[PDB]
Amino acid sequence: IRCIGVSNRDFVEGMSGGTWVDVVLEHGGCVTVMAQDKPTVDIELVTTTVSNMAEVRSYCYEASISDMASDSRCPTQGEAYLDKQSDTQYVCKRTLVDRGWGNGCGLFGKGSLVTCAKFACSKKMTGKSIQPENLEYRIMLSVHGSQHSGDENRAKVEITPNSPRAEATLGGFGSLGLDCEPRTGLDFSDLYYLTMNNKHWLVHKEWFHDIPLPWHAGADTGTPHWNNKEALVEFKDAHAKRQTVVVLGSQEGAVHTALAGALEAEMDGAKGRLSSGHLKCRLKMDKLRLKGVSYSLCTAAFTFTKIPAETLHGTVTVEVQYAGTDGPCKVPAQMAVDMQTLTPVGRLITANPVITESTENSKMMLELDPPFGDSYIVIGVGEKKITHHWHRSGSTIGKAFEATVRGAKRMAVLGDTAWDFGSVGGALNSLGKGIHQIFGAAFKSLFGGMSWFSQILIGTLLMWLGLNTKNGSISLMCLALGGVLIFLSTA
Amino acid sequence: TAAFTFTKIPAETLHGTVTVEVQYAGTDGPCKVPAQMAVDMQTLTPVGRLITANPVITESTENSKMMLELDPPFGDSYIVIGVGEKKITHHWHRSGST
Amino acid sequence: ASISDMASDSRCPTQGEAYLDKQSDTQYVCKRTLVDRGWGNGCGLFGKG
Amino acid sequence: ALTQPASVSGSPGQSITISCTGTSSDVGGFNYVSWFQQHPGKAPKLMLYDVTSRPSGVSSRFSGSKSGNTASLTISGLQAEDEADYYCSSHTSRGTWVFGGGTKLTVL
Amino acid sequence: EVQLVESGAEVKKPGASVKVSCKASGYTFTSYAMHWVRQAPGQRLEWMGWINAGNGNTKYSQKFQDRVTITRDTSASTAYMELSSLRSEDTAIYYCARDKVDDYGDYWFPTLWYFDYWGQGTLVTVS
Amino acid sequence: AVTLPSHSTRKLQTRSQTWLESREYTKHLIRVENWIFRNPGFALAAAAIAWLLGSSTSQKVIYLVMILLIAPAYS
């Protein structure tokens, strides 16, 4: 529930620590955590809001110019000086002009001309600094059980670095403890929050500082003072006897293409909502109980109300309607083959299905994991058990291949953190995570300033290099190539 | 034996040490502050070093304040303050390596 | 030369950069540097302001 | 220079809050926020410094908070001897001090 | 303990100049800076400036940059504030407040508790 | 101004799409293809210059490709 149709959901099965399971929550999909005798819980990260950001260096992308003026000197005099060069609101430029004996200077060299124009800025854009503190994540979790396809089954958890751990209380189901890592989530110490005109981005530092545009420096208080004041003013000169000042055009469509690989964000009031990150939580399910045990079996009748449907991962959701007034009651349901010997094959994802109301025609939804052959969804007790025919497509080998592809994509997206998704904890997992940290630091230092094409080019180049170098470094090249080219062809 | 609150944050100095400022709500008189740096909240095993004294609150009033500084390990960790079921915790990440 | 009424402006480690209103005046010499800050000084963060 | 409410009233026994809105140079960026209480005739008395922190001989009822550009003094358990003028002050980034407009609290 | 006592109230016609003292007792006068704060009748407090009693540096507010001079007398443990060219707006009460000076002898950053002790006040009436 | 660094160097990696993700590959290929289509004579000149450099055939082909990539960008 809440994760049935996500198409990017991940199943975290069982626990070997007995109590807790690590998990990395991402904005794209969600995680269904299923223990041995505990209810399946679907956990998703919904929003990350950043609060009270501090302004840094608003740039100016649309300039306007004003009353130009100029000054000039005979070929053998000093240099031209306009009294508006002592004003920090004027852009001024000095050049040499052909002068003499016709213009009113008796000498024939090159005189000095100074032209000044008053600079004003419309439509500054502004960046703000994010600190890993005062950054809040919202986690929504829900429980399986009695909920129909459409409150003791859902919970919302707010997590900030001040309170990184929380407990979601699900009445009658107990409570799920989460200890999470909010600081090291998405690196918000190199990322500014940029706004141009009611459009906000998550932008890297050291891109918001190498921009060639007239920039203020934080606290705009009175008369704004733009520092570069050029990069929007072009000083042309006519045939050695004039000078002209023009402004460059509005620069907002050049920045839109300069941004590429910078995340979009939205803003509510003083807070900025990001819809792309990843949090890491350890889930302590040791106070999670099964509400439904010690219930008598439901024996009246069951009718399929929608149909059995297949999610994108192979599981089967089934919505049933119960006819008898029995009360809180446990639903018999299974997957079977050879309906003479009803031997439970496959696994059922709902931890325990239970009908929780005492009315005539109640509704419930369960989900189950069928085997790969043809099978029968059997729901009922005896002489009134409805059976639906089910057919699952692909053998176990395809499942293992898809699992490796998902793992590779998760590694390419999360970097080293990918080793923490089933991180119950072993020497092998820790060794893999460590050597991946070393190799990731090295790879990000060497490469990582490339963008899907520089990486493809260098990948093909090094691929030829390792293919025909004939030394023992063949393997080093080809492995770096595996890395680069998959980093390209998986995103 | 009372509850602590984080008055500001656990700031990070330039050399990696954390400064934590805590507020005490109980009135037990001069009493030791139970503070540690831990991972795996299940088994609270003290990791890192606390470059502070066996931190103590001096006053005996309703709300008092304390500042202690810690030398945490290079991984992610949790500042654990308090004894049980009231121990506030903060998430803290250190960058360097040995 | 002769010098006159000095003034200064400081900011916390994670803010923008300091800006005096007398930087937009072409009669003042201004210099910008980094200063130790934090908690004691009165701004809560410990970097260089 | 600091935006403070004109007056605030509350019945004895309940909590109340006085806000103080400043800019990113005095209250927004610095923990240099102080609250002074002034009974008529007497000189102001430092009730809170360092935002939350408060001096030695001050009742623990006074609390301080800060969010963005707004500081806030909270008085829980409004007693009798609390009708006075409350002023917020901040040390600006440029090295000057700014005070608040003033709030006259009435315990009724 | 710490006691800052100012001179008595004074009445002056416009155009004149007032000089108000602030005698400090109960602490080392040389290791503190004295601020002067003016409060209009039933209005906000106004910070006017400070003087570092150690070396003698001063800093005045922009509003009084060229109307106020603050000096000190260490041997007598006094801090004087002189305001010239009085106006009808200057009718207000003048307080003096201490603040600890850094251990290096400079007063760049003030200590978190700036105005821990004040003076009783001195009414200057501009008629 | 004229330079305006590209952000694809510091591409933020996450599950979601970045700002202009659909345009990167066709962007660079379109620039190169358009310049070469407008100027074939330089294809001849780059073939010749690459032939004068590099002993083995692979080195000469790599030089040709790198010249035909450096020229459209005037990098």
mmCIF file of N, CA, C and O in Angstrom, chain A residues 8 26 201-204 206-207 210-213 231 251 254 256 258-264 276 413 448-449 451-453 457 464, chain F residues 1-21 24-25 27-29 32 58 62 65-66 69:
data_model
loop_
_atom_site.group_PDB
_atom_site.id
_atom_site.type_symbol
_atom_site.label_atom_id
_atom_site.label_comp_id
_atom_site.label_asym_id
_atom_site.label_seq_id
_atom_site.Cartn_x
_atom_site.Cartn_y
_atom_site.Cartn_z
ATOM 1 N N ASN A 8 9.333 1.724 -9.051
ATOM 2 C CA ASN A 8 10.720 1.845 -8.633
ATOM 3 C C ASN A 8 10.839 1.465 -7.171
ATOM 4 O O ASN A 8 11.617 2.050 -6.416
ATOM 5 N N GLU A 26 15.029 6.923 -1.240
ATOM 6 C CA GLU A 26 15.249 7.874 -2.312
ATOM 7 C C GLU A 26 13.926 8.506 -2.688
ATOM 8 O O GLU A 26 12.857 8.017 -2.324
ATOM 9 N N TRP A 201 16.525 26.634 -8.450
ATOM 10 C CA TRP A 201 17.362 25.488 -8.752
ATOM 11 C C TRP A 201 18.237 25.158 -7.557
ATOM 12 O O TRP A 201 18.515 26.007 -6.715
ATOM 13 N N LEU A 202 18.681 23.916 -7.509
ATOM 14 C CA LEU A 202 19.760 23.478 -6.643
ATOM 15 C C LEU A 202 21.011 23.411 -7.502
ATOM 16 O O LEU A 202 21.074 22.622 -8.454
ATOM 17 N N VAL A 203 21.991 24.236 -7.166
ATOM 18 C CA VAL A 203 23.113 24.545 -8.033
ATOM 19 C C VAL A 203 24.382 24.256 -7.258
ATOM 20 O O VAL A 203 24.382 24.315 -6.028
ATOM 21 N N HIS A 204 25.451 23.897 -7.952
ATOM 22 C CA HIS A 204 26.696 23.655 -7.246
ATOM 23 C C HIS A 204 27.348 24.974 -6.874
ATOM 24 O O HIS A 204 27.254 25.961 -7.601
ATOM 25 N N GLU A 206 31.008 26.779 -6.704
ATOM 26 C CA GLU A 206 32.095 26.751 -7.677
ATOM 27 C C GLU A 206 31.590 26.604 -9.108
ATOM 28 O O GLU A 206 32.392 26.451 -10.033
ATOM 29 N N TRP A 207 30.278 26.645 -9.307
ATOM 30 C CA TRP A 207 29.673 27.093 -10.547
ATOM 31 C C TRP A 207 28.978 28.423 -10.379
ATOM 32 O O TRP A 207 28.975 29.226 -11.306
ATOM 33 N N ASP A 210 32.067 31.049 -10.515
ATOM 34 C CA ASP A 210 32.715 31.349 -11.785
ATOM 35 C C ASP A 210 31.712 31.780 -12.845
ATOM 36 O O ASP A 210 31.733 31.260 -13.950
ATOM 37 N N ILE A 211 30.853 32.743 -12.553
ATOM 38 C CA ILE A 211 29.904 33.278 -13.527
ATOM 39 C C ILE A 211 30.330 34.697 -13.863
ATOM 40 O O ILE A 211 30.552 35.495 -12.947
ATOM 41 N N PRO A 212 30.466 35.046 -15.127
ATOM 42 C CA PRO A 212 30.899 36.397 -15.515
ATOM 43 C C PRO A 212 29.769 37.417 -15.661
ATOM 44 O O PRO A 212 29.379 37.822 -16.750
ATOM 45 N N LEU A 213 29.221 37.863 -14.537
ATOM 46 C CA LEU A 213 28.140 38.830 -14.559
ATOM 47 C C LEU A 213 28.303 39.794 -13.396
ATOM 48 O O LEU A 213 28.855 39.422 -12.355
ATOM 49 N N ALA A 231 30.572 43.034 -18.778
ATOM 50 C CA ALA A 231 30.069 41.719 -19.147
ATOM 51 C C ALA A 231 28.603 41.886 -19.506
ATOM 52 O O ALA A 231 27.916 40.926 -19.865
ATOM 53 N N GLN A 251 20.499 37.841 -21.079
ATOM 54 C CA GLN A 251 21.322 36.850 -20.388
ATOM 55 C C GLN A 251 20.559 35.775 -19.626
ATOM 56 O O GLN A 251 21.180 34.962 -18.944
ATOM 57 N N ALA A 254 20.840 32.445 -21.674
ATOM 58 C CA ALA A 254 22.185 31.891 -21.627
ATOM 59 C C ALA A 254 22.427 31.159 -20.319
ATOM 60 O O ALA A 254 23.114 30.133 -20.295
ATOM 61 N N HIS A 256 20.004 29.724 -18.535
ATOM 62 C CA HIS A 256 19.167 28.530 -18.573
ATOM 63 C C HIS A 256 19.883 27.366 -19.239
ATOM 64 O O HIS A 256 19.650 26.209 -18.883
ATOM 65 N N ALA A 258 23.360 27.350 -19.389
ATOM 66 C CA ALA A 258 24.496 27.113 -18.507
ATOM 67 C C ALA A 258 24.124 26.148 -17.397
ATOM 68 O O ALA A 258 24.938 25.319 -16.988
ATOM 69 N N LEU A 259 22.902 26.248 -16.890
ATOM 70 C CA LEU A 259 22.367 25.241 -15.986
ATOM 71 C C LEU A 259 22.008 24.000 -16.784
ATOM 72 O O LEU A 259 21.146 24.044 -17.662
ATOM 73 N N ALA A 260 22.680 22.897 -16.507
ATOM 74 C CA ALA A 260 22.336 21.630 -17.134
ATOM 75 C C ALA A 260 22.960 20.562 -16.267
ATOM 76 O O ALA A 260 24.184 20.455 -16.209
ATOM 77 N N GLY A 261 22.139 19.777 -15.601
ATOM 78 C CA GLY A 261 22.621 19.002 -14.489
ATOM 79 C C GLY A 261 22.444 19.670 -13.152
ATOM 80 O O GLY A 261 23.010 19.198 -12.164
ATOM 81 N N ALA A 262 21.674 20.745 -13.086
ATOM 82 C CA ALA A 262 21.352 21.423 -11.843
ATOM 83 C C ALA A 262 19.903 21.134 -11.518
ATOM 84 O O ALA A 262 19.037 21.290 -12.378
ATOM 85 N N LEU A 263 19.641 20.704 -10.295
ATOM 86 C CA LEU A 263 18.320 20.175 -10.003
ATOM 87 C C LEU A 263 17.294 21.293 -9.948
ATOM 88 O O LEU A 263 17.607 22.427 -9.617
ATOM 89 N N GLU A 264 16.064 20.975 -10.304
ATOM 90 C CA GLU A 264 14.983 21.912 -10.073
ATOM 91 C C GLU A 264 14.544 21.836 -8.621
ATOM 92 O O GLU A 264 14.690 20.805 -7.963
ATOM 93 N N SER A 276 14.439 15.718 -4.893
ATOM 94 C CA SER A 276 15.453 14.761 -5.319
ATOM 95 C C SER A 276 16.565 14.733 -4.285
ATOM 96 O O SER A 276 17.301 15.709 -4.141
ATOM 97 N N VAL A 413 23.928 5.546 -9.078
ATOM 98 C CA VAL A 413 23.236 6.737 -8.593
ATOM 99 C C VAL A 413 23.763 7.174 -7.233
ATOM 100 O O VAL A 413 24.019 8.361 -7.013
ATOM 101 N N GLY A 448 35.159 12.802 -13.495
ATOM 102 C CA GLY A 448 34.130 13.479 -12.741
ATOM 103 C C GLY A 448 33.976 14.949 -13.039
ATOM 104 O O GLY A 448 33.149 15.608 -12.401
ATOM 105 N N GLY A 449 34.752 15.485 -13.972
ATOM 106 C CA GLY A 449 34.508 16.798 -14.520
ATOM 107 C C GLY A 449 34.083 16.665 -15.964
ATOM 108 O O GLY A 449 34.451 17.483 -16.810
ATOM 109 N N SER A 451 30.871 15.122 -18.884
ATOM 110 C CA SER A 451 29.417 15.238 -18.992
ATOM 111 C C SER A 451 28.927 14.423 -20.187
ATOM 112 O O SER A 451 28.682 14.968 -21.264
ATOM 113 N N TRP A 452 28.815 13.117 -19.986
ATOM 114 C CA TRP A 452 28.108 12.181 -20.856
ATOM 115 C C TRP A 452 28.751 12.047 -22.226
ATOM 116 O O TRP A 452 28.596 11.020 -22.884
ATOM 117 N N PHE A 453 29.573 13.000 -22.620
ATOM 118 C CA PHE A 453 30.176 12.953 -23.939
ATOM 119 C C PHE A 453 31.684 12.933 -23.838
ATOM 120 O O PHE A 453 32.332 12.098 -24.471
ATOM 121 N N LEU A 457 33.633 9.745 -24.924
ATOM 122 C CA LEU A 457 34.829 9.859 -25.749
ATOM 123 C C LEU A 457 36.028 9.231 -25.061
ATOM 124 O O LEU A 457 36.729 8.401 -25.648
ATOM 125 N N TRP A 464 40.011 1.396 -26.668
ATOM 126 C CA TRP A 464 40.997 1.039 -27.688
ATOM 127 C C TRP A 464 42.393 0.909 -27.085
ATOM 128 O O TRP A 464 43.147 -0.018 -27.417
ATOM 129 N N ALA F 1 28.075 37.063 -19.476
ATOM 130 C CA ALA F 1 28.985 37.412 -20.551
ATOM 131 C C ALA F 1 29.127 36.270 -21.532
ATOM 132 O O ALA F 1 28.181 35.537 -21.791
ATOM 133 N N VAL F 2 30.336 36.117 -22.059
ATOM 134 C CA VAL F 2 30.566 35.190 -23.156
ATOM 135 C C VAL F 2 30.878 33.774 -22.676
ATOM 136 O O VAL F 2 30.477 32.803 -23.325
ATOM 137 N N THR F 3 31.571 33.622 -21.547
ATOM 138 C CA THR F 3 32.031 32.290 -21.153
ATOM 139 C C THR F 3 30.913 31.466 -20.516
ATOM 140 O O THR F 3 30.483 30.456 -21.080
ATOM 141 N N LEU F 4 30.411 31.898 -19.355
ATOM 142 C CA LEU F 4 29.267 31.260 -18.704
ATOM 143 C C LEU F 4 29.439 29.753 -18.550
ATOM 144 O O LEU F 4 28.925 28.983 -19.370
ATOM 145 N N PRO F 5 30.178 29.303 -17.539
ATOM 146 C CA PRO F 5 30.548 27.888 -17.452
ATOM 147 C C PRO F 5 29.336 26.977 -17.474
ATOM 148 O O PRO F 5 28.289 27.296 -16.913
ATOM 149 N N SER F 6 29.486 25.828 -18.120
ATOM 150 C CA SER F 6 28.416 24.847 -18.142
ATOM 151 C C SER F 6 28.372 24.098 -16.822
ATOM 152 O O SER F 6 29.406 23.845 -16.201
ATOM 153 N N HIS F 7 27.165 23.755 -16.387
ATOM 154 C CA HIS F 7 26.972 23.036 -15.140
ATOM 155 C C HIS F 7 27.046 21.531 -15.312
ATOM 156 O O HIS F 7 27.143 20.816 -14.315
ATOM 157 N N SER F 8 27.012 21.027 -16.543
ATOM 158 C CA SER F 8 27.097 19.588 -16.749
ATOM 159 C C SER F 8 28.407 19.007 -16.239
ATOM 160 O O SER F 8 28.514 17.786 -16.098
ATOM 161 N N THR F 9 29.404 19.847 -15.967
ATOM 162 C CA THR F 9 30.610 19.383 -15.295
ATOM 163 C C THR F 9 30.301 18.875 -13.893
ATOM 164 O O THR F 9 30.786 17.815 -13.486
ATOM 165 N N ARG F 10 29.488 19.613 -13.142
ATOM 166 C CA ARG F 10 29.123 19.274 -11.769
ATOM 167 C C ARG F 10 27.729 18.677 -11.682
ATOM 168 O O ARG F 10 26.974 18.998 -10.766
ATOM 169 N N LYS F 11 27.364 17.816 -12.629
ATOM 170 C CA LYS F 11 26.013 17.275 -12.696
ATOM 171 C C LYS F 11 25.623 16.598 -11.395
ATOM 172 O O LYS F 11 26.330 15.722 -10.898
ATOM 173 N N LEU F 12 24.490 17.021 -10.844
ATOM 174 C CA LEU F 12 23.970 16.456 -9.607
ATOM 175 C C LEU F 12 23.331 15.113 -9.913
ATOM 176 O O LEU F 12 22.410 15.034 -10.728
ATOM 177 N N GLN F 13 23.809 14.060 -9.262
ATOM 178 C CA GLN F 13 23.405 12.699 -9.584
ATOM 179 C C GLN F 13 22.323 12.245 -8.617
ATOM 180 O O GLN F 13 22.551 12.195 -7.404
ATOM 181 N N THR F 14 21.157 11.909 -9.155
ATOM 182 C CA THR F 14 20.029 11.471 -8.347
ATOM 183 C C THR F 14 19.078 10.687 -9.242
ATOM 184 O O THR F 14 19.298 10.559 -10.448
ATOM 185 N N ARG F 15 18.016 10.150 -8.639
ATOM 186 C CA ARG F 15 17.050 9.375 -9.410
ATOM 187 C C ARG F 15 16.296 10.249 -10.403
ATOM 188 O O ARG F 15 15.929 9.790 -11.490
ATOM 189 N N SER F 16 16.048 11.506 -10.048
ATOM 190 C CA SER F 16 15.241 12.387 -10.876
ATOM 191 C C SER F 16 16.059 12.983 -12.018
ATOM 192 O O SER F 16 17.289 12.988 -12.004
ATOM 193 N N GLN F 17 15.348 13.494 -13.016
ATOM 194 C CA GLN F 17 15.997 14.146 -14.141
ATOM 195 C C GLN F 17 16.534 15.513 -13.740
ATOM 196 O O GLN F 17 15.957 16.217 -12.910
ATOM 197 N N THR F 18 17.644 15.892 -14.354
ATOM 198 C CA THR F 18 18.261 17.182 -14.093
ATOM 199 C C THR F 18 17.567 18.243 -14.946
ATOM 200 O O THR F 18 16.517 17.991 -15.540
ATOM 201 N N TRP F 19 18.129 19.452 -15.012
ATOM 202 C CA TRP F 19 17.405 20.566 -15.618
ATOM 203 C C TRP F 19 17.132 20.310 -17.094
ATOM 204 O O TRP F 19 15.981 20.115 -17.497
ATOM 205 N N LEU F 20 18.172 20.261 -17.918
ATOM 206 C CA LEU F 20 18.001 19.972 -19.342
ATOM 207 C C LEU F 20 18.748 18.684 -19.624
ATOM 208 O O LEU F 20 19.899 18.701 -20.054
ATOM 209 N N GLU F 21 18.080 17.558 -19.400
ATOM 210 C CA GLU F 21 18.753 16.280 -19.572
ATOM 211 C C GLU F 21 18.617 15.768 -20.993
ATOM 212 O O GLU F 21 19.539 15.139 -21.517
ATOM 213 N N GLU F 24 21.570 16.997 -24.027
ATOM 214 C CA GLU F 24 23.030 17.000 -23.944
ATOM 215 C C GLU F 24 23.680 16.352 -25.167
ATOM 216 O O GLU F 24 24.528 16.957 -25.854
ATOM 217 N N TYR F 25 23.312 15.100 -25.435
ATOM 218 C CA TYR F 25 23.977 14.334 -26.479
ATOM 219 C C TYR F 25 23.757 14.958 -27.848
ATOM 220 O O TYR F 25 24.716 15.230 -28.588
ATOM 221 N N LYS F 27 22.955 17.901 -28.360
ATOM 222 C CA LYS F 27 23.603 19.207 -28.337
ATOM 223 C C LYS F 27 24.996 19.137 -28.947
ATOM 224 O O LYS F 27 25.307 19.826 -29.933
ATOM 225 N N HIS F 28 25.850 18.295 -28.370
ATOM 226 C CA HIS F 28 27.235 18.270 -28.848
ATOM 227 C C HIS F 28 27.335 17.698 -30.259
ATOM 228 O O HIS F 28 28.079 18.228 -31.104
ATOM 229 N N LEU F 29 26.592 16.623 -30.542
ATOM 230 C CA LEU F 29 26.651 16.050 -31.882
ATOM 231 C C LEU F 29 26.163 17.041 -32.926
ATOM 232 O O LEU F 29 26.699 17.094 -34.035
ATOM 233 N N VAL F 32 28.942 19.692 -33.687
ATOM 234 C CA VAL F 32 30.028 19.150 -34.505
ATOM 235 C C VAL F 32 29.551 18.894 -35.932
ATOM 236 O O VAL F 32 30.225 19.256 -36.906
ATOM 237 N N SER F 58 46.560 3.870 -36.254
ATOM 238 C CA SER F 58 45.676 4.220 -35.150
ATOM 239 C C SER F 58 45.967 5.619 -34.637
ATOM 240 O O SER F 58 45.041 6.386 -34.348
ATOM 241 N N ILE F 62 43.282 8.704 -34.645
ATOM 242 C CA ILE F 62 42.968 9.411 -33.410
ATOM 243 C C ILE F 62 43.264 10.897 -33.553
ATOM 244 O O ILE F 62 42.495 11.742 -33.082
ATOM 245 N N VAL F 65 40.413 12.455 -35.555
ATOM 246 C CA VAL F 65 39.207 12.645 -34.751
ATOM 247 C C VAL F 65 39.383 13.806 -33.782
ATOM 248 O O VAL F 65 38.479 14.632 -33.608
ATOM 249 N N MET F 66 40.552 13.906 -33.150
ATOM 250 C CA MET F 66 40.753 14.966 -32.169
ATOM 251 C C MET F 66 40.834 16.340 -32.822
ATOM 252 O O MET F 66 40.362 17.320 -32.243
ATOM 253 N N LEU F 69 37.352 17.350 -33.620
ATOM 254 C CA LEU F 69 36.603 17.758 -32.437
ATOM 255 C C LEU F 69 37.060 19.106 -31.895
ATOM 256 O O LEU F 69 36.243 19.870 -31.376
#
